[PDB]
Ligand SMILES: CC(=O)N[C@@H]1[C@@H](O)[C@H](O[C@@H]2O[C@H](CO)[C@@H](O)[C@H](O)[C@H]2NC(C)=O)[C@@H](CO)O[C@H]1O
């Protein structure tokens with residue numbers, strides 16, 4: 001009475017085959033106050049299924065101490081989908097990639113003894129099985145699986161482990177075996193899937209991800225053809241442009257897949273959202289997760305893409321009866337034109353007329369009628385006759401975005417951050433350089449390295465107007481070199497090269513000298529074989545040269561450590577622990593100073609609109625509102641990349657339609673109304689680089705045609 005299964009044609013919910021349309025929405029990348037609106041917009045967008053990852057490190061920050069409150073209430077979210085009459089594809093992982101901090105693993109797991117991630121490792125296996133069954137049990141015990149009348153029609157184990165397995169060989173294959181048996185062994189009564197996993201054992205369905213997945217078939221002829229990630233654009237990286245994917249192209253790619261026995265297809269993302277706080281975004285991943293998704297980062301309709309995929313869906317749902325009661329038969333129409341036809345014994349008949357020419361329109365003749373086909377398009381004919389839809393004929397209105405002010409300036413106070421120097425009292429030292437995560441345990445982005453440099457009077461450069469040459473190599477991702485409380489300079493990396501080098505002249509008077517290195521991380525890596533074994537922080541080499549000696553290796557001497565900022569230790573970001581300290585009001589408030597906290601109370605503007613903070617006057621740091629981290633800001637990181645103009649037609653790659661070059665990577669920083677009170681709201685910014693807070697404005701977001 002309540003079962004979901006499959007055959008060679010589709011997933012089978014309660015005995016019937018379904019052509020399921022899905023979309024991705026990650027619950028922590030929005031707020032619970034938004035979830036109903038998103039979900040409603042999704043359903044009205046033509047969606048039958050809501051897809052989401054589970055965010056393990058979000059859910060178990062401490063070993064033992066679990067979190068499921070607020071925007072991490074996973075159970076709350078799914079029931080909100082069920083109340084909408086939509087199904088859920090629950091991609092549990094626990095590895096999730098997702099452009100999410102460390103790929104979803106909690107950092108503490110790294111330091112469990114004997115541990116190795118994503119392999120045939122028994123400490124990893126027990127931990128993963130633990131969190132997985134914990135999550136399956138949770139679903140079970142609120143009867144959320146379709147087996148029990150709930151919305152979960154399938155669950156995913158691991159995530160795209162196939163390419164990693166190829167690289168690591170035998171233990172990888174053992175591991176995927178273990179993971180599949182372990183996951184189905186939880187006896188969920190709905191099917192399990194793995195993406196990018198041809199290896200996948202019965203009864204698990206292997207799926208694919210990509211911009212296009214139409215030539216995919218799964219690894220047994222009795223499993224159905226499922227597309228778990230239709231990439232609806234790309235992610236934004238700090239220092240990169242805003243990537244876009246044209247809607248005619250997404251439609252063509254989906255039509256192409258459905259036309260050749262596509263049965264299940266999920267957009268990634270449908271709502272991308274925001275990487276709030278400092279434990280969400282991954283290595284160099286912008287705070288904005290817009291992704292050119294059908295619902296934009298703020299929850300608004302991204303037209304025309306939203307409406308165009310809505311209409312695609314409508315044409316599919318008209319075709320669905322023919323589609324579940326027949327198979328795809330192809331017929332040549334031309335050198336780059338085909339027809340894919342689903343003729344049922346019953347008599348239902350749907351056909352897809354396609355034109356793979358990326359340059360020229362084409363007219364074909366199909367069952368006595370002509371049909372024009374624009375370049376790079378498919379027409380859907382749910383009755384083998386009427387061309388109700390064509391992937392390239394967009395009949396929704398465009399909609400430009402307007403970010404319009406709502407503040408125009410506020411009343412700011414400033415508190416300046418300690419610039420620490422090495423000290424004989426210092427608690428936490430060692431005789432060499434320590435890897436950052438090992439010291440901070442991802443407790444803060446910031447990790448001070450401090451050491452003493454003895455400079456005697458004999459030294460030659462003291463008489464002449466010379467300076468000695470300091471050279472600091474570090475695994476990433478930002479570095480500020482401080483020489484006797486003097487900031488000498490700042491260096492930073494990229495998503496593809498987070499390693500950095502400072503090398504320059506430093507003023508060292510006679511006596512003991514104080515070298516202080518602040519070493520910043522920008523999220524942790526989330527993808528790559530053994531990505532969890534890459535380093536952050538300074539591990540050198542570190543050398544001082546131009547002296548009576550040749551060069552002095554500062555890496556073989558004593559170093560002191562301070563984890564995080566003093567302002568963090570005083571919790572200057574919260575409601576309670578905010579006014580513990582000496583803040584500076586009025587004209588004395590610091591401009592263009594590095595390592596500076598700011599403060600301001602504001603009232604919630606008028607309107608329904610969603611709101612962001614314009615941060616273009618700022619450099620880099622973290623934003624907080626009423627003690628809740630909006631997330632990192634880095635407008636000082638201007639976007640690089642070849643981003644010339646775009647046509648929907650032709651094979652899409654993610655660099656094809658890029659926008660926003662020469663501008664801040666992210667300038668507007670989404671503020672959830674869900675977090676504001678009508679008056680008395682606390683805004684706390686830690687500016688890292690240097691900025692002018694009097695430029696910080698709120699803005700209202702609105703789209704018009
Ligand atoms: C699961 C399923 O039926 N898939 C369809 C395929 O069957 C179909 O063609 C298949 O082609 C093979 C060689 O032409 C045959 O060996 C195979 O038996 C045949 N399937 C059937 C049921 O006869 C493809 C063509 O795209 O569509 C799939 O939907």
Ligand SMILES: OC[C@H]1O[C@@H](O[C@@H]2[C@H](O)[C@@H](O)[C@H](O)O[C@@H]2CO)[C@H](O)[C@@H](O)[C@H]1O
Nearest residue numbers: 096097098099159160163196209229527
């Ligand atoms: O891009 C966001 C989305 O991509 C997926 O990862 C793909 C792919 O599936 C991996 O096998 C491939 O190695 O790299 C790309 C992205 O780096 C992933 O499934 C999602 O979680 C997201 O990262």
Ligand SMILES: *[C@@H]1O[C@H](CO)[C@@H](O)[C@H](O)[C@H]1NC(C)=O
Nearest residue numbers: 430433434435437438439440
């Ligand atoms: C790892 O962690 C601790 C500090 O928490 C430190 O004592 C230890 O030496 C570190 N080891 C390495 C190899 O970095």
Ligand SMILES: [Cl-]
Nearest residue numbers: 024051052053
């Ligand atoms: Cl997802």
